[PDB]
């Protein structure tokens, strides 16, 4: 109620001692739909719950470079800007140094990209969280980014809408994932995505994209009926 | 045209750049940052392009207040002999041209 | 209005910029400058507003700044604004006299500073240059002219007009007692004193509380000629002689 | 009414057509350090009151009366910071003029240029006007000259004037006193006495400063000279 | 462009001016020619002051105490000394103290360095500031050395030979100006002894 | 709030007191000025009319036709719940519809069961403006408050609207709360709101009207992370059906929830501002 | 600014008041007082001095790291009173500008001219709507070839001036008055006498008969025109001599 | 326990508590204030049709508004604001001209909408008050797209935007099938535009411009429109 | 609310500040257009006299090209810039293209200049509208309308500024191929449409006559008065 005065700029503090317009950007993640992202020792899987059938094809999962891609939960102007930035970082790493770009490092580059706005007038926080899944020498990666300039390393996560259901599944089976196959790890991701869905709804190779990179595998976005073979094996919402 | 053409064209550029290099290396990143933020603020205060402007705040922040050059005393731009359209001049400064 | 009256970029429901209308009000509160285009020339009669006993004059004219050989202007409104605007009027004229070697035809020069003042409304963060200027002129195209410009850029051409204080009042007195085609500079200078004397209540136009500048043509050269103390003393005492003769007639 | 929106912004006109930040920068002038300019036969005097009257002050540091070129100087009431940066500029423009026309800048010319700085600083938005007014005197063409530039950038020649505090009282006393033919031996005394009208304490070489133009050119009067003029009046 | 124009040297004739050069040269034709000092100039240090010698004079003004001879172009020697004069007047006006010969020297050097000796100011810069009698050898290309004596221009070699033969570490004023006069006399045309204390 | 570098700018108000001063003015009560805000007054009204008479209706629906319950819904999801649960069975013949404009809005249609003209319904999927809310209570309720009429107000709220010690994200994606009237003698069913927590707009207008004329009313407030047609929101309007308030109005939950399947698959052309 | 100016007379620095006041420069003078220490400078025959009472409230805070005495060049000191960050920043600016002066000319900045520069930088802060004053009071000392010891002070509002004793900070005005009467009856103070006056001015107005680690004495002499502050031993010996006589 | 007037909806930068930039969605309401534009991508090309909403019989229906050509194969159908359409038409047209002047290839439809969302998404100091509808048959084959205030693009098979965006996209939902012919798209766009339009579809109050793999983007003539809208 | 910035939308979906520049148009002086048989005419009222005012300096019909001319009816200084700048861009085109410049071309320029002033709230949209008539290379008669919003639109009969609708509605009837065939009839038509606009005839009217062969050439008030008396004689016949 008093936060009134101090909530309408990103470059003003409150008596309470917190910037509310960064917290509102971190509510704008939730206006976008539930992406899941979970990895093993061989592969780093993403899944995306795509909110007409003719209109709004909605490209939630995006491919950044050979070794790396993302899935999108929130403001889509910002999703685009951030993804396009990452493509340039990795292009330049393979132009000068002639290698991939570490996923940790690339998520850190996005971190500082997304801090400038919040500590600048005439700017607003990039209103979107990513699930930034690459594979390095290191091994597979998931890296949650938040609409706030801070970010995480993850072995599983979900961000977007009613996405706590997924997060809960991904804690229950967190251990399974580490030692799963490509397709095992995928069905786990899809069952988190299906925990988010109402019980009256289902995956039904329709609201499923799957964005998997791994060891020889490059980041490949299975969509439409390239997700059918992964959902063949998955069975029994119960 | 002449070597000096460009040495003089970018004289001020390739001095205050050198000042910021010195300050970075000695004082720290903060010292250029602070000076820069002052300069840009006080050269968001002048007339529209098409009137000749007396920017007392920017000049004294550089230490030019008590220093003349050929820049000042040749090719008098305050009695400019070639001016454009007021509106179109302002558009150019805005970056609409 | 209480809104739409701030930035000079912000229109009203009606479609009004009240900022620019308040710059017109700032002309309202300024030296009466009464111009009367004539046959023989075109005169620029005035109220010499500032006439304090300690106040000194080390200038050629008070409100009347000349532009080139062939043009002069007056000033009613914001004084500092006017200083930079009247320097700019000279410089405009001289750039045309540098490229085309002709003394700027009158409309061009008026219009040029109107574009400046129209930018100073268009672009918000600038203040509407709160001056009106009455341009006595000669050119090869349109013989003699009188002009006005406004803070807005809205400019006109005139047979007689006024700017400043009791300005609409003065224009009414001109519309009574002006006779387009008959009006020599003689009878225009008579009308000028008359209308000043009728519109403002300054003793009997004290000659140091009025000033005229007559842009005439003599041996095919334009002659911008301030009227002496002596010579407006002659115009006002003759106006008062006629007043007294007419007082005896009535 | 309050009409306070109009009295914050310097880029606005008021309902009736007033520029009110100008008026409030002239209010900063009108709470200034009393100065008196008396353009006399044999040169001008700029006799002023010092904003220090202290036991602790270095006489050689601060000057109300500063030269711009040899033959010109000026004095101020209102703002010291503002004054000082305006006269750094004044000196520049005098020397620019002497590199272009090789003529010691006329008092009128210089006045225009420093009042064109004042013009810009009322015009633009996101700045304030200067809260200081300048009695820019000096000697040219076998003639004394005095002017009075403003926060707004309106400037006017003067025979006799005053600014700062009890300064309308200054000009009243000075209208009663100043003669057209009053020469500078007697104008320094007159300016000392115009200060006495607008003074608070006992007046001494410390508590006032004086500086004059001449045939020769502009200077400041030594503490000795100022107390000798105060002893002679 | 619709960009406000600025001041300084304008480099627009340049290539078209060099087309004039090329044509006229080729045919055997004259274009107006640069006017020079071609002066013997001189300077010395003595116990407690400076003298500046020249021939007809090359000795120009900088500050009340600082003077500055001119060899090279006449245009450019006069221009630089006049502009640097104005600069040291501005410096002094604020400082409160007559300006220094180190100030004069730094400024001249730095200005002539910016314009890379395309402007001909080979100057002998002699003042007696607070820190005492200073003499320099300002050059067109923005070089200088702080020397007890230096000669430049038209018979500099003969003048310098006289100097170095007939110099004493700490002179008297009259023998110091005697030296600069006989040095000018060797290079040459009235001797021009601008003595400073 | 500065269009140029260093524009003198003022703060947004909690009280809109400058707006109350603009009220005072009425644009200096100028004839054209007062005329055009009366053109905006007849733009921004309600106009109760039914399309069986195809006329306009004057005074009342609840004192005009008998009222025993009156089942309100204020939001897409609130009216989706009355579409789903109450009106899977029955006629619910239309008697009325508030025909309004505001900037933001969308139908405001009134009904009453054919079996029981007694029992009444509203579906306000639109928004009614702060000025039009008392005009809306001067239409359907009209005058002569009965206190013989269970005013079952349902409303869809945002998870963020709710005040709590944990963050607005820490709140469970769905819940609902109650606020019910002195008279109302039946269960809150959900928890009643907290002290800091308040409501406003038309649902508040109805429950506040009800309280001052001591009428049984309850304001169900579905604080859900979505504000758009969602199975979970309408099955968090579920609890209402299994209270007195909505017990003889709901039918056959299998039928209802298959109809709700339909409501979900109606779909939008949803804009491309998130993905 | 980017966000802009602020409706109200005391709410932005580029808005004049009905009376004709700028109020955020007067609140930058409240920021001198917010400092929480007093400084006293004392000029003399041979020496200029700058003393300030010491505070280091936290035991842990290493007392070596916490001072209000800085130097700008070898020959020219300051003492500060006001806000730590802003005072360190004004000290740093004085270094840049002293070096700029010296680079431009090839002789070092005078005390008065450095004070003038910092006061002109402050004038620009207070005329511009983006920037604000540095709420800190720089009190330069140093020996001049011609003019000898130079006690000068420069302000957040941006007014520079010379003095023969200065006092600033919390007891600013109380200590100004102490020094008025000391200087009224001045004895062409040498190193000892100037430092005595300054120490004991602070020890009167704050009423703290100091330990060596409850004051900080910076001082310069014609003897040693290098600005040089005292050791615990030296500043102790001063206080001991003021207690003995 | 008090009501506050907090505004996040005056500023395009300002987020609601829920995290909404309202001015973008208020520019979506400005697309809805504009004229209905129905495009249908097929196997045998992509069509664009759009209503002109001609009001008077004094305004010239012979003149062409609401639809444009950008190269050989691609144009788009504008809907919302024609003033804002113009600057994004220019982007598309110049950057595909540049593609033909760089690679000697005409730029793919996905890449033209990339170029257009680089000139958009840049708030012009307001969320672009136009939606374009980029219908080209590129190297890859037929392609419809949709642009919005937020600045971004998204790929389409059958899209209706503008006045009756969802009024006419629900008709497309029933009418369009994957194996549509370009003839079908043409007629279906038009007949659904007809049953949207409050006026009766003649060739004067519609712009259609359609592309096939074979026959490059052209503007359906008075007579071609007349023939189809006689049948439909 | 959203009428305190040029560059904001509303829930109803409007730029009200841009529509307030169109209210500044609406406070105009009736400017009328016709696009006839190898003729175009721009009748526009003189509105006010002021006894002692030169009329040369204040005219409502300005000529842009050999084969383009316009009739502005909003703000005066705003329109002066638009018209000056329409001649700038006309000359740019003419020089580069080597074409007698299209009417449409410069109506699109005037429109796009006003669009360039619609897209900042640190600028204002020129609150003026012009009836830019004329001919093409080949000689096709033209009439257009340009708006503060910054759209161009094609027309046959037009009527803008003061009493816009009144005089447009006159033309809805009186604009016909048998009032068009000849140049007399199109001059008569705009005069008789301004004999709806303003009381006085041949008195407060200022009427441009550009043909396929000819250019603006402003008429005399005697020439217009002849045609006022011709339609008065037609009214005597009827």
């Amino acid at each position: 109620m008093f936060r009134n005065q101090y909530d309408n700029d990103v470059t003003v503090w409150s008596p309470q001692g917190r910037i509310h317009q960064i917290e509102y950007a971190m509510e704008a993640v939730k206006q976008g739909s539930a992406t899941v992202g979970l990895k093993s020792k061989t592969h780093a899987v993403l899944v995306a719950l795509k909110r007409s059938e003719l209109a709004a094809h909605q490209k939630k999962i995006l491919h950044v470079d050979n070794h790396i891609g993302i899935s999108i939960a929130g403001l889509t102007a910002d999703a685009r800007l951030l993804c396009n930035f990452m493509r340039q970082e990795c292009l330049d790493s393979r132009f000068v140094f002639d290698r991939p770009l570490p996923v940790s490092r690339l998520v850190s580059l996005i971190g500082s990209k997304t801090q400038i706005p919040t500590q600048r007038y005439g700017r607003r926080p990039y209103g979107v969280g990513l699930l930034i899944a690459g594979y390095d020498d290191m091994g597979p990666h998931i890296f949650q980014t938040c609409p706030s300039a801070n970010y995480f390393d993850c072995r599983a996560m979900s961000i977007g809408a009613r996405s706590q259901s997924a997060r809960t599944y991904l804690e229950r089976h967190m251990s399974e994932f580490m030692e799963c196959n490509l397709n095992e790890l995928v069905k786990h991701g899809l069952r988190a995505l299906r925990e988010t869905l109402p019980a009256e709804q289902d995956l039904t190779t329709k609201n499923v994209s799957i964005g998997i990179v791994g060891k020889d595998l490059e980041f490949t976005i299975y969509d439409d009926d390239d997700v059918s073979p992964f959902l063949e094996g998955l069975e029994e919402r119960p | 045209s002449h070597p000096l053409e460009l040495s003089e064209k970018n004289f001020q550029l390739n001095q205050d750049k050198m000042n910021f290099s010195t300050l970075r290396n000695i004082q720290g990143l903060f010292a250029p940052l602070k000076l820069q933020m002052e300069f840009k603020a006080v050269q968001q205060v002048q007339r529209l392009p098409f009137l000749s402007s007396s920017n007392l705040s920017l000049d004294v922040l550089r230490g030019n207040d008590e220093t003349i050059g050929f820049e000042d005393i040749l090719n008098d731009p305050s009695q400019s002999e070639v001016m454009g359209e007021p509106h179109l001049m302002v558009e150019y400064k805005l970056g609409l041209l | 209005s209480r809104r739409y009256d701030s930035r000079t970029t912000i229109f009203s429901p009606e479609g009004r910029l009240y900022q620019v209308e308040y710059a017109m009000e700032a002309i309202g509160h300024a030296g009466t400058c009464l111009g009367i285009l004539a046959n023989d020339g075109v005169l620029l009669a005035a109220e010499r507003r500032n006439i304090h006993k300690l106040l000194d004059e080390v200038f050629f004219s008070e409100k009347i700044y000349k532009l080139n050989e062939d043009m002069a202007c007056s000033v009613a409104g914001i004084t500092s604004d006017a200083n930079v605007l009247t320097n700019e009027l000279r410089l405009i004229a001289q750039r045309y006299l540098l490229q085309y070697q002709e003394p700027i035809p009158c409309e061009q020069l008026v219009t040029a500073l109107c574009d400046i003042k129209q930018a100073y409304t268009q672009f918000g963060g600038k203040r509407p240059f709160g001056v009106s200027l009455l341009y006595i002129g000669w050119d090869k195209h349109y013989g003699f002219q009188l002009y006005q410009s406004d803070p807005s850029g809205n400019y006109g051409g005139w047979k007689a007009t006024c700017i400043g204080n009791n300005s609409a009042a003065a224009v009414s007195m001109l519309k009574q007692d002006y006779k387009e085609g008959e009006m020599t500079l003689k009878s225009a200078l008579a009308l000028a004193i008359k209308v000043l004397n009728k519109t403002m209540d300054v003793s009997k136009l004290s000659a140091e509380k009025v000033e005229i500048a007559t842009l005439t043509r003599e041996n095919g050269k334009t002659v911008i000629r301030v009227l002496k103390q002596k010579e407006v003393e002659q115009l006002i005492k003759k106006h008062e002689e006629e007043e007294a003769k007419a007082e005896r007639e009535k | 009414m309050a009409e306070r929106g109009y009295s914050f912004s310097l880029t606005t006109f008021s309902p009736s057509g007033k520029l009110v930040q100008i008026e409030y920068a002239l209010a900063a002038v009108a709470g200034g350090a009393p100065s008196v300019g008396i353009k006399a036969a044999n040169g001008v005097v700029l006799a002023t009151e010092k904003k220090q009257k202290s036991i602790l002050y270095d006489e050689r540091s601060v000057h109300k009366v500063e030269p711009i070129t040899k033959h010109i100087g000026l004095v101020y009431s209102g703002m010291g910071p503002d004054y000082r940066v305006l006269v750094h500029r004044a000196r520049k423009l005098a020397q620019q003029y002497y590199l272009v026309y090789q003529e010691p800048i006329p008092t009128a010319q210089l006045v225009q240029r420093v009042a064109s700085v004042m013009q810009e600083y009322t015009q633009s938005g996101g700045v304030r006007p200067f809260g200081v007014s300048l009695l820019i005197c000096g000697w040219n063409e076998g003639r004394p000259y005095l002017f009075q530039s403003d926060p707004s950038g309106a400037y006017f020649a003067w025979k006799a004037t005053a600014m700062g505090k009890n300064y309308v009282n200054g000009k009243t006393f000075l209208e009663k006193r100043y003669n057209e033919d009053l020469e500078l031996e007697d104008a320094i005394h007159t300016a000392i006495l115009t200060l006495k009208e607008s003074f608070e304490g006992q007046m001494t070489e410390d508590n006032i400063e004086v500086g004059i133009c001449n045939e020769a050119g502009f200077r400041r009067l030594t503490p000795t000279e100022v107390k000798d003029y105060l002893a002679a009046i | 462009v619709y960009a406000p124009p600025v001041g300084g040297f304008s480099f627009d004739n340049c290539r078209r001016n060099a087309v004039l050069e090329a044509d006229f040269a080729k045919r055997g034709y004259k274009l107006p020619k640069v006017r020079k000092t071609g002066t013997t100039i001189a300077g010395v240090v003595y116990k407690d002051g400076i003298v500046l010698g020249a021939d007809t004079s090359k000795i120009h003004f900088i500050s009340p105490n600082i003077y500055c001879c001119g060899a090279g172009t006449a245009a450019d020697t006069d221009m630089t000394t006049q502009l640097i004069s104005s600069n040291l007047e501005l410096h002094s006006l604020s400082t409160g103290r007559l300006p220094r010969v180190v100030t004069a020297n730094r400024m001249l050097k730095q200005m002539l360095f910016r314009y890379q000796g395309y402007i001909g100011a080979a100057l002998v810069l002699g003042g007696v500031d607070v820190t005492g009698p200073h003499l320099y050898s300002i050059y067109p290309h923005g070089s200088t050395d702080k020397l007890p004596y230096v000669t430049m221009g038209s018979g500099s070699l003969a003048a310098m030979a006289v100097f170095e033969d007939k110099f004493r570490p700490d002179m008297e004023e009259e023998e110091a100006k005697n030296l600069v006069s006989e040095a000018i006399a060797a290079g040459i045309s009235n001797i021009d002894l601008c003595v400073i204390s | 709030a500065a269009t140029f570098f260093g524009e003198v700018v003022k703060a947004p108000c909690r009280a809109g007191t400058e707006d109350e001063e603009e009220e005072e003015e009425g644009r200096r009560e100028t004839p054209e000025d007062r005329e055009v805000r009366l053109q905006l007054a007849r733009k921004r009204e309600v106009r109760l009319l039914r399309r069986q008479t195809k006329t306009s209706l004057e005074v009342s629906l609840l004192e005009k036709y008998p009222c025993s319950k009156f089942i309100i819904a204020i939001g897409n999801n609130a009216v989706a719940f009355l579409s789903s649960f109450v009106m899977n069975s029955g006629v619910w013949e239309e008697v009325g519809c508030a025909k309004l404009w505001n900037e933001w809005c969308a139908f405001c249609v009134f009904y009453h069961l054919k079996s029981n003209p007694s029992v009444f319904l509203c579906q306000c999927s639109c928004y009614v403006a702060e000025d039009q809310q008392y005009q809306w209570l001067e239409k359907v309720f009209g005058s002569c408050p009965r206190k013989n009429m269970q005013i079952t107000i349902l409303t869809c709220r945002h998870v963020t609207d709710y005040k709590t010690s944990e963050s607005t994200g820490s709140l469970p994606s769905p819940f609902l709360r109650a606020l019910k009237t002195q008279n109302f003698k039946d269960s809150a069913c959900c928890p009643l709101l907290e002290q800091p927590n308040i409501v406003h707009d038309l649902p508040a207008a109805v429950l506040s009207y009800c309280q001052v004329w001591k009428i049984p009313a309850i304001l169900y407030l579905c604080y859900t992370d979505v504000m758009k047609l969602d199975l979970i929101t309408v099955e968090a309007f579920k609890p209402i059906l299994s209270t007195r308030s909505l017990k003889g109005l709901v039918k056959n939950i299998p039928q209802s929830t298959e109809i709700l399947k339909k409501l979900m698959t109606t779909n939008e052309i949803q804009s491309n501002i998130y993905t | 600014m980017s966000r802009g100016s602020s409706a109200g007379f005391d709410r932005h620095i580029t808005i004049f008041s009905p009376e004709g006041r700028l109020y955020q420069v007067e609140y930058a003078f409240k920021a001198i007082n917010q400092g929480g220490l007093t400084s006293v400078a004392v000029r003399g025959k041979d020496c200029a001095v700058i003393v300030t009472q010491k505070k280091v409230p936290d035991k842990l805070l290493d007392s070596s790291t916490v001072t209000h005495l800085f130097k700008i060049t070898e020959n020219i000191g300051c003492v500060m009173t006001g806000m730590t960050a802003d005072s360190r920043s004004q000290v740093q600016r004085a270094r840049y500008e002293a070096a700029n002066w010296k680079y431009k000319y090839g002789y070092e900045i005078p005390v008065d001219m450095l004070c003038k520069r910092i006061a002109d930088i402050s004038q620009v802060y207070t005329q511009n709507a983006e920037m604000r004053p540095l709420g800190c009071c720089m009190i330069l000392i140093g020996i001049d070839e011609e003019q000898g010891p130079q006690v000068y002070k420069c302000d957040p509002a941006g007014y520079y001036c010379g003095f023969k004793a200065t006092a600033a900070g919390v007891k600013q005005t109380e200590s100004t008055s102490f020094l008025e009467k000391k200087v009224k009856k001045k004895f062409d103070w040498t190193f000892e006498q100037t430092v005595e006056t300054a120490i004991t001015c602070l020890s009167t107005v704050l009423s703290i008969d100091f330990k060596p680690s409850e004051i900080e004495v910076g001082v310069v002499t014609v003897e040693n025109p290098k600005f040089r502050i005292l050791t615990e031993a030296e500043i102790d010996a001063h206080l001991v001599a003021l207690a003995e006589r | 326990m008090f009501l506050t007037r907090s505004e996040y909806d005056r500023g395009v930068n300002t987020f609601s508590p829920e995290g909404r930039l309202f001015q973008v969605e208020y520019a979506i309401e400005a697309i809805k204030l504009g004229s209905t534009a129905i495009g249908i991508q097929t196997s045998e090309g992509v069509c664009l049709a759009v209503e002109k909403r001609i009001t008077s019989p004094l305004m010239e229906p012979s003149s062409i508004e609401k639809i444009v050509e950008i190269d050989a194969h691609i144009g788009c159908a504008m809907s919302g604001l024609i003033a804002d359409a113009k600057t994004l038409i220019d982007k598309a047209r110049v950057e595909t001209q540049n593609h033909w002047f760089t690679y000697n290839e005409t730029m793919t439809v996905e890449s033209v909408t990339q170029a257009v969302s680089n000139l958009a998404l840049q708030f012009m100091s307001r969320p672009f008050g136009v939606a374009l509808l980029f219908g080209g048959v590129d190297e890859k084959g037929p392609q419809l797209f949709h642009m919005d205030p937020s600045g971004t693009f998204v790929q389409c098979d059958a899209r209706a935007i503008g006045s009756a965006s969802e009024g006419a996209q629900s008709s497309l939902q029933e009418v369009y099938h994957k194996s549509m012919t370009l003839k079908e798209a043409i007629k279906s766009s038009l007949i659904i535009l007809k049953q949207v339009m409050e006026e009766k579809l003649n060739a004067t109050n519609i712009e259609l411009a359609t592309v096939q793999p074979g026959q490059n983007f052209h503007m359906f003539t008075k007579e071609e429109l007349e023939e189809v809208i006689k049948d439909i | 609310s959203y009428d305190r910035a040029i560059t904001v939308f509303s829930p109803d979906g409007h730029l009200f500040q841009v529509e307030y520049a169109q209210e500044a148009v609406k406070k105009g002086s009736t400017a009328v257009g016709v696009r006839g048989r190898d003729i175009v005419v721009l009748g526009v009222e003189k509105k006010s006299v002021a006894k002692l005012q030169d009329e040369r300096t204040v005219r409502k019909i300005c000529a842009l090209d050999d084969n383009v001319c316009m009739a502005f009816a909003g703000l005066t200084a705003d329109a002066r810039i638009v018209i000056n700048r329409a001649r700038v861009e006309c000359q740019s085109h003419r020089l580069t293209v080597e074409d007698p410049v299209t009417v449409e071309y410069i109506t699109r320029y005037i429109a796009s200049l006003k669009q360039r002033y619609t897209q900042s709230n640190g600028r204002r949209p020129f609150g003026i509208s012009a009836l830019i008539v004329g001919f093409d290379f080949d000689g096709t008669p033209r009439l257009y309308q340009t708006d503060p919003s910054g759209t161009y639109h094609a027309w046959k009969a037009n009527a803008i500024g003061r009493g816009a609708k009144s005089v447009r509605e006159f033309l809805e009837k009186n604009y016909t191929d048998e009032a068009i065939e000849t140049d007399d009839l199109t001059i008569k038509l705009v005069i008789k449409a301004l004999l709806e606009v303003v009381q006085s005839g041949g008195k407060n009217i200022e009427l441009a006559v550009m043909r396929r062969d000819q250019s603006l050439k402003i008429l005399n008030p005697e020439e217009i008065e002849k045609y006022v008396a011709e339609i008065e004689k037609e009214k005597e016949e009827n």
Side-chain angles (χ1 to χ4, degrees), chain A residues 170-171:
Chain A
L170 293 161
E171 286 174 6

PDB file of all heavy atoms in Angstrom, chain A residues 170-171:
ATOM      1  N   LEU A 170      10.187 -33.460  -9.996  1.00  0.00           N
ATOM      2  CA  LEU A 170      11.615 -33.423 -10.398  1.00  0.00           C
ATOM      3  C   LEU A 170      12.503 -33.570  -9.157  1.00  0.00           C
ATOM      4  O   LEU A 170      13.666 -33.967  -9.324  1.00  0.00           O
ATOM      5  CB  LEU A 170      11.905 -32.128 -11.165  1.00  0.00           C
ATOM      6  CG  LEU A 170      11.228 -32.005 -12.533  1.00  0.00           C
ATOM      7  CD1 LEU A 170      11.189 -30.558 -12.998  1.00  0.00           C
ATOM      8  CD2 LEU A 170      11.896 -32.885 -13.583  1.00  0.00           C
ATOM      9  N   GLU A 171      11.964 -33.275  -7.970  1.00  0.00           N
ATOM     10  CA  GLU A 171      12.604 -33.559  -6.655  1.00  0.00           C
ATOM     11  C   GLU A 171      12.428 -35.041  -6.308  1.00  0.00           C
ATOM     12  O   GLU A 171      13.397 -35.649  -5.813  1.00  0.00           O
ATOM     13  CB  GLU A 171      12.012 -32.680  -5.551  1.00  0.00           C
ATOM     14  CG  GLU A 171      12.470 -31.236  -5.617  1.00  0.00           C
ATOM     15  CD  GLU A 171      11.801 -30.290  -4.637  1.00  0.00           C
ATOM     16  OE1 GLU A 171      11.023 -30.765  -3.786  1.00  0.00           O
ATOM     17  OE2 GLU A 171      12.063 -29.074  -4.727  1.00  0.00           O
TER      18      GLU A 171
END
